[PDB]
Ligand binder design. Structure first.
Ligand SMILES: [Zn+2]
Lengths: 153, 155
């Protein structure tokens, strides 16, 4: 197929009025800029993305749309620690710490909330900081990722 | 003289009523638990702290007090980038970025101000992120530090 740019995103429309086939990406695969995918319905579709979003493909991103037929990115659920801060200071401590670990971090709905992939040591760290948290199955959406602009590799 | 635990801190009494002699430390020396120092007046003072404060020694921490004589810690000024965030989201962004560089990071007076030692790569990153900052000669006091915990593996 060879898609070089997105068509838009399912958020723009009422999805039920369309028939939608998915490419299932794992949260860690969304920065893929050139790759072959077979869809959920078995269609082979190529990606040579000229200007990919810096952060990755997000839930809903439409790779192909013809008439009522859509092919959209879907992001698979993964085990996640949801973090709930109670102060600006604790927001800073968490983000600094998780930063020092090079672990992925995602904005939640509240600027005191975050999500990060479940790892026993991130869990242990949070417990040591006495930060309210819980483990659950959830979606890490590329548009909510915190950036790393000058990482030491 | 070998010091095993802090007596209090100068904030709790009136230093103007005492002879205070200081041990001068740079911000990056404040986490020593076992160390040898010379005070400003030339006195030798060794520390072996059974139970060091987790954040490091802070401005005014008292090593020794007897009669009207005190030996206290002084943290020297150093060149600091003061950062001024605009929102909690931006505080998260800054701390995570600085975290990934392993730069030291400290709270400022306001809950949206942070301080980080001056380093040119750190300055470039803040300019890249469009963050407000300026470079001042200023104190990084241990009790305001943000720290890094147990063991962290860096593939
Ligand atoms: Zn590192």
């Amino acid at each position: 197929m060879i898609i070089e740019r997105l068509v838009g995103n399912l958020r723009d429309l009422n999805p039920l009025d369309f028939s939608v086939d998915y490419v299932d990406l794992e949260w860690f695969e969304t920065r893929k800029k050139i790759a072959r995918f077979k869809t959920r319905q078995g269609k082979d579709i190529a990606i040579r993305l000229k200007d990919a979003p810096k952060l990755g493909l997000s839930q809903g991103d439409i790779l192909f749309k013809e008439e009522k037929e859509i092919i959209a990115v879907n992001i698979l659920d993964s085990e996640v620690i949801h973090i709930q801060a109670k102060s600006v200071a604790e927001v800073a401590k968490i983000c600094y710490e998780i930063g020092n670990r090079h672990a992925a971090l995602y904005y939640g709905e509240s600027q005191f909330e975050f999500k990060t992939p479940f790892e026993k040591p991130t869990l242990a760290l949070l417990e040591k900081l006495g930060v309210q948290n819980r483990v659950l199955s959830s979606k890490l959406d590329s548009k909510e990722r915190l950036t790393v602009s000058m990482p030491h590799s």
